[PDB]
Scaffold this active site. Structure first.
Site, PDB file in Angstrom:
ATOM      1  N   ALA A 170     -19.194  72.876  19.568  1.00 45.05           N
ATOM      2  CA  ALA A 170     -19.172  71.857  18.963  1.00 45.05           C
ATOM      3  C   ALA A 170     -20.477  70.933  18.199  1.00 45.05           C
ATOM      4  CB  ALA A 170     -18.287  70.768  19.339  1.00 45.05           C
ATOM      5  N   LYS A 220     -29.447  64.531  20.558  1.00 47.61           N
ATOM      6  CA  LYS A 220     -28.309  64.791  19.649  1.00 47.61           C
ATOM      7  C   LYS A 220     -27.529  63.710  19.830  1.00 47.61           C
ATOM      8  CE  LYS A 220     -25.876  66.297  15.899  1.00 47.61           C
ATOM      9  NZ  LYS A 220     -25.546  67.831  16.426  1.00 47.61           N
ATOM     10  N   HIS A 222     -23.625  62.773  18.324  1.00 47.71           N
ATOM     11  CA  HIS A 222     -22.688  63.590  17.734  1.00 47.71           C
ATOM     12  C   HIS A 222     -21.231  62.943  17.906  1.00 47.71           C
ATOM     13  CE1 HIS A 222     -19.813  66.815  16.289  1.00 47.71           C
ATOM     14  NE2 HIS A 222     -20.847  67.743  16.350  1.00 47.71           N
ATOM     15  N   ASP A 224     -18.469  64.039  18.245  1.00 49.26           N
ATOM     16  CA  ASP A 224     -17.545  64.438  19.178  1.00 49.26           C
ATOM     17  C   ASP A 224     -17.745  64.018  20.782  1.00 49.26           C
ATOM     18  OD1 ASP A 224     -16.652  66.225  17.217  1.00 49.26           O
ATOM     19  OD2 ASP A 224     -16.780  68.060  18.301  1.00 49.26           O
ATOM     20  N   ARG A 339     -13.128  64.818   3.663  1.00 52.70           N
ATOM     21  CA  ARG A 339     -14.463  65.530   4.357  1.00 52.70           C
ATOM     22  C   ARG A 339     -14.989  66.499   3.314  1.00 52.70           C
ATOM     23  NH1 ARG A 339     -15.962  67.373  10.556  1.00 52.70           N
ATOM     24  NH2 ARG A 339     -16.990  68.771   9.841  1.00 52.70           N
TER      25      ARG A 339
HETATM   26 NI    NI Z   1     -22.589  68.574  13.136  1.00 49.69          NI
HETATM   27 NI    NI Z   2     -23.876  71.099  14.372  1.00 47.45          NI
END
Ligand code: NI
Ligand code: NI
Ligand code: NI
Ligand code: NI
Lengths: 570, 100, 122, 570, 100, 100
Positions: A170, A220, A222, A224, A339
């Site tokens: 992900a 990063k 993110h 998620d 989205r």
């Molecule tokens: Ni992404």
């Molecule tokens: Ni990605």
């Protein structure tokens, strides 16, 4: 004695004023200047110029201005220009761009570009030479992804992941000191440059920072893992201290804020906004407005590039599959409809053409194609030429301005954003010799030869049992740069300054070249070559219509692309 | 079977040619890799049939015509080279400008 | 006797989530013009500023919905949701930086929330 | 608020009382207990629970009870139980089995199972998780055998061989100090745990012992090298001194003795009896009587497992081919008829079901299939359920007792026999994180993901060029745990205590984790989990009929098996 | 598909057999690897059909005769061995002196 | 040909589908990998034919029916995903519950 231009180009590659078609697109690049001396062109072979006493000097030792490698007669396509030159490489780096040969008997030889006993020769006549692509959105999920990237001219993979674990499937994240150490050790066997991102999540500094000290090269953030105001803030405080870049995949669901809340948490600090259009994720529906801001370095991922007739059907279903959505859960179909938007995907084509989205990237194996960054960049440029016309800045009928704008998106801009442009991202003197040769008929589709640190790493080459290398089957194969310990000297592991100062390479027994990430916090949109436009991007909350300077940005999807069914077996 | 490296690779050329032939039979204009696979397999099977190198340099130019392939494909293929085991051992065949 | 490879044969009954914890029903309105979707385990008082509800009733609580699911608020939508109590140490750190400690410090949480424009304080 | 059980299992995997079918067998396993707190299940993804401030803790550094990896919602099938839990991994080892997440806001979090910044996540909901298989009968003949083993969930290879030399093609033996050193060095590149057996042959101690000091992890006594009373004796004297295990393939031909002579030479010392049924070799016809004795740790190899209609025809011919027999030499047909017996092969099925044969193994490439140990274990259990009924010890309609009995045969029992159960062989806290995830539809057939030392080593995963990892072709592929120097940290080379104390690893430059073989000489049949029955096995010399407790052990061969033509392409 | 290592390898035997069969159909005397591929694929497809090991040991001796193959090929092939998934699991088939 | 990594892999899907089709033609009920190969190759050849993603999501559900395959196979295949080069570039096709 004079040579007609057709015959000249057939023998030595094109010269000033000549144009070359990029693959099967409608894009033409024009040679802007040429460093040669007509009649003293360098060339190698039976009875040719680079021979002892002649175009090869027989006197000087290697340290006395002699090259390890000369690429003869290259047509360079780079942010710096579109021009004809010899490229000289020494100690793995580009040391000269100009005119190679022997000063004994030739005019105009660049002083440190002597062909001597120590020099290998690659013939680049009739080839287009570019920097290796810099993919800053890589999910490390399946090691078979590396050859995929190499085959389309990618030489640097920045991202994260531990393999096919759900976190990595992900998010571009290699979490914590132990996973980071393990993946730095795995990287020793990957024939490509690599930089690793840690998890940009937490509400205390220490848990985030210890990843940077362990060997991560950036972070990063993110959704998620929780793309909250706190994780955003803490990551950027760490990045400003460590001098590394932060990427973000923002909160699509607007759970703890809308776009303006995420911008407030950023607080003017520099950040790389991934898949800025938003099909790949981010504040619905208006995340693409990030690309107007001065402190934002904006990239696209590649499935939306460019806008085609199958795009929406494909993306709606891709999102259903990858995000595990059910058509019988009303919230899931509303989520998908919020989205995946034709309005923002069509505008993304035009924002690339205007220089408002500065970079391309893959999103390899999470929602993007490892071997199609370069491919889709040129397909987009071609679509924009057809729909919008040659840019106003073009001259004397070429597509050079557009070509420099678009080559920058996958070469120098990602390198600048990541703090690694002192080493890679362009064909300039003093930078690592990561070079991709292309036959013009295959330009952007399938690389001919990929040079890594001055030695060929990957090539399209034929039968290994044949008398000569050209008989079938011609396929992409790893070359001697990837074998034995030469994989260590031809590739760079990019790491934070603190991990390097704390001796991580020695601790882990890393043998690869170690590259330092630096100068990532004092840059902005103005530093993105040919793609430095800041503007107010308005995205209508009801209709999703995109406006820049009061005008609606719209274009049609195309039914056909170049660099497609003429080339691929599947 | 005692397959060597080249035998394993060259099986994949035959397969690509079978794929392309099926594509041509259902009416498609062939692309670059498809055209190369068909002509390459033709040469290797010709060698297996006991034809000479000279026969295959001739015949290879008549396997596919420009109407069989997509626009630009003829001009993309300057030549097709293949090595196969003839009755007198491995020989190289090059078919020059196979599709006019 | 038809065999579905790897199939389940689940027991009888139902699974009660968040058993034994106080439940609270509150009305929440999305006053913004973009959709907001809220997960099961976010401290409810720290959700998007533009969700209007009695912020004090979100303190120390989260949505009483299956783990990993969410409640969705379209632009202008008002509806009721059911909350449950946070467990463990009943401490929240980060997120919107409204708590950073015990959820028992209601006056401090609300003061921060009001100052930062999180709609619905008092 | 309540969730029905069907929907609960679809989202989080099964819970207490739910049953799951093993592949296409008739075997059902039942969840015995669940460590979760209903409503605080851990799960990862967009808007899910493991997010900063929520199910992921944002405060703690890695050393402060934070995991490197959490496997969420696993259905564990192990000798220890069949139950639902999260599995936490740190520093390559299993450190917690229980409930993962954040103690800030969740109830019931196991104290050292915090999901923090440092934690990677694997979703195991809907998967069955087992220990990696321990194959203690491996002939190292062809390096392509390793992926074969990995694909069917094997993570440890114990045996011997130098490649396709006749010694190694017949016997699990890496002979002498030099061959042992060479194969320890080769092992550096194999993505699987390895232990090497020396030649258990000689009449002086020194020649045998010097192999143990060189780095061997045990010995093999094989009839092809002379399975005489002397070689048996000397090997067991060495093993008792060195604390390593001895395996035996006894004298089929009864040349220097019958079974009782081999038992007298053993003299009550512990020994692992390979392919105890005897089709794979050993005193004809009555070698299987070894499995009744207290000092014998008995394994089967896999071609005879289970007894099917093609077994006898296949084995008679296999033996003719591999033992080079001629139908025109009367002694060779008598030999074959004395060795390949339906009476003992049918009884072997039943001895497995009763817990009298404790272990399974392959005999990879000598007379057995590298990728079918796990496969054939479950096929045998399924055949026994059909023919003998659910065992008496079953309760409330499940096959849990049988499932624990049979999973032990290829996990914990081989590890105990070899003296390596402190490191591998089961899903327990403090043991190496070698874990195999299975989709229930593929259970025992093809592994989903194989974790080695906490990093995925092998996975069934699709197109490396695709937008997501699930598109075709989905095939078994080596992952990042096998690349570069990460192959060293994710795998164990098991060695004797004396070689470790004498500094063999440093001498040879071994970088793999070094595991110590210990506690192999004070164990017996009673230590084989769920398979600890000692009894008097009578094998009639005239009819080959097998009797246990006065009863004839017989069953029919089956025409069809599950885990067969529904799954395999060939 | 969940292809394992053996499934991928054994696809290439089928392909070699398809190649050989096409060669035989256009009138060629088959060579060593061609003959081995045909008989091997026959065994593996026989297993897939649900034939017994004993049926395939019989049938395998009648797939190719000496007139189908080049001089010396019969004597080069002492036996052909193949493992495939029968209805009762993987079994080994050996066809002895397949071409008389 | 300039084969890239994906082109080489995807040739093997075509081959597996040819194998499965021959198995179906001689009357066999197909298994799991066989069914997946047939439907996957159908999608990739459909893309090559110039069909849309939407056409192939429809058509993919009618390639094989439950009577074509072994017991349990329909329920084992939740979906089949394949990426191929359409006239407008690489696109992903997912066929949901292909065999009812
Ligand atoms: Ni992404
Ligand atoms: Ni990605
Ligand atoms: Ni043996
Ligand atoms: Ni053996």
């Amino acid at each position: 004695m004079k040579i007609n231009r057709q015959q000249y180009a057939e023998s030595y590659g094109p010269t000033v004023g000549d144009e070359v078609r990029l693959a099967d697109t409608d894009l033409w690049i024009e040679v802007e200047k040429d460093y040669t001396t007509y009649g003293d062109e360098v060339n190698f072979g039976g009875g040719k110029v680079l021979r002892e006493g002649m175009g090869e000097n027989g006197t000087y030792t290697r340290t006395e201005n002699v090259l390890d490698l000369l690429l003869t007669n290259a047509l360079i396509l780079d942010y710096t220009g579109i021009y004809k030159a010899d490229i000289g490489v020494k100690d793995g780096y580009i040391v000269g761009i100009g005119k190679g040969g022997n000063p004994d008997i030739m005019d105009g030889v660049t002083p440190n570009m002597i062909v001597g006993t120590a020099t290998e020769v690659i013939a680049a006549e009739g080839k287009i030479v570019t920097a290796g692509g810099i993919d800053t959105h890589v999910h490390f999920i399946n090691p078979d992804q590396v050859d995929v990237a190499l085959a389309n001219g990618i030489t640097t993979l920045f991202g994260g992941g531990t393999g096919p674990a759900e976190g990595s499937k992900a998010t571009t994240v290699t979490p914590g000191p132990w996973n980071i150490e393990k993946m730095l050790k795995s990287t020793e066997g990957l024939p490509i440059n690599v930089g690793i991102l840690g998890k940009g999540h937490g509400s205390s500094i220490a848990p985030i920072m210890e990843q940077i000290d362990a060997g991560a090269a950036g972070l990063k953030i993110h959704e998620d893992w929780g793309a909250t105001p706190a994780s955003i803030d803490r990551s950027l405080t760490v990045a400003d201290e460590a001098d590394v870049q932060v990427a973000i995949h923002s909160d699509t669901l607007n759970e703890a804020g809308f776009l303006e809340d995420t911008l407030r948490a950023i607080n003017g600090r520099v950040i790389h906004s991934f898949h800025v259009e938003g099909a790949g994720g981010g504040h619905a529906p208006d995340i693409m407005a990030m690309a107007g801001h001065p402190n934002v370095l904006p990239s696209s991922t590649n499935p939306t590039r460019p806008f085609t007739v199958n795009t929406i059907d494909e993306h709606l279903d891709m999102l259903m599959v990858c995000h595990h959505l059910k058509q019988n859960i009303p919230e899931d179909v509303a989520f998908a409809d919020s989205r995946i938007r034709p309005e923002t995907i069509a505008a993304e084509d035009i924002l690339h053409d205007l220089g408002i989205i500065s970079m391309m990237s893959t999103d390899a194996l999470a929602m993007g194609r490892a071997g199609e960054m370069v491919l889709r960049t040129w397909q987009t440029a071609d679509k924009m030429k057809k729909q919008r016309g040659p840019l106003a800045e073009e001259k004397n009928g070429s597509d050079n301005f557009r070509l420099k704008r678009y080559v920058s998106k996958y070469t120098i801009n990602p390198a600048i954003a990541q703090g690694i442009a002192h080493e890679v991202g362009s064909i300039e003197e003093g930078k690592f010799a990561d070079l991709v040769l292309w036959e013009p008929k295959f330009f952007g589709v399938k690389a001919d030869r990929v040079i890594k640190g001055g030695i060929i790493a990957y090539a399209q080459i034929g039968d290994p049992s044949a008398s000569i290398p050209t008989p079938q089957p011609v396929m992409g194969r790893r070359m001697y740069g990837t074998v034995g310990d030469l994989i260590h000297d031809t590739n760079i592991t990019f790491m934070s300054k603190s991990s390097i100062q704390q001796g991580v390479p020695a601790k882990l027994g890393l043998k690869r070249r170690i590259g330092t990430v630096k100068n990532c916090r004092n840059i902005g949109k103005k530093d993105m070559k040919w793609n430095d436009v800041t503007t107010d991007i308005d995205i209508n909350p009801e209709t999703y219509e995109v406006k820049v300077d009061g005008e609606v940005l719209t274009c049609e999807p195309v039914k056909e692309l170049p660099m497609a069914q003429r080339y691929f077996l599947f | 079977m005692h397959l060597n490296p080249a035998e394993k690779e060259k099986l994949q050329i035959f397969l690509a040619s079978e794929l392309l032939l099926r594509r041509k039979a259902r009416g498609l204009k062939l692309n670059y890799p498809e055209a190369v696979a068909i002509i390459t397999s033709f040469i290797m099977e010709g060698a297996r049939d006991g034809k000479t190198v000279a026969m295959l340099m001739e015949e290879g130019k008549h396997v596919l015509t420009r109407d069989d392939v997509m626009e630009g494909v003829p001009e993309m293929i300057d030549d097709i080279q293949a090595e196969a085991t003839f009755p007198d051992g491995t020989k190289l065949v090059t078919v020059h400008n196979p599709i006019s | 006797n038809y065999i579905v490879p790897g199939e389940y044969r689940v027991a009888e009954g139902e699974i009660e989530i968040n058993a034994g914890r106080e439940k609270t029903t509150i009305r929440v309105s999305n006053t913004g013009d973009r959709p907001i979707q809220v997960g099961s385990h976010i401290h409810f008082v720290e959700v998007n500023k533009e969700l209007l509800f009695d912020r004090a009733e979100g303190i120390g609580r989260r949505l009483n919905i299956p783990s990993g699911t969410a409640a969705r608020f379209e632009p202008g939508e008002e509806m009721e949701v059911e909350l449950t109590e946070l467990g463990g140490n009943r401490e929240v750190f980060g997120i919107s930086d409204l708590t950073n400690g015990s959820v028992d410090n209601k006056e401090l949480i609300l003061q921060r929330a009001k100052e930062l424009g999180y709609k619905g304080v008092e």
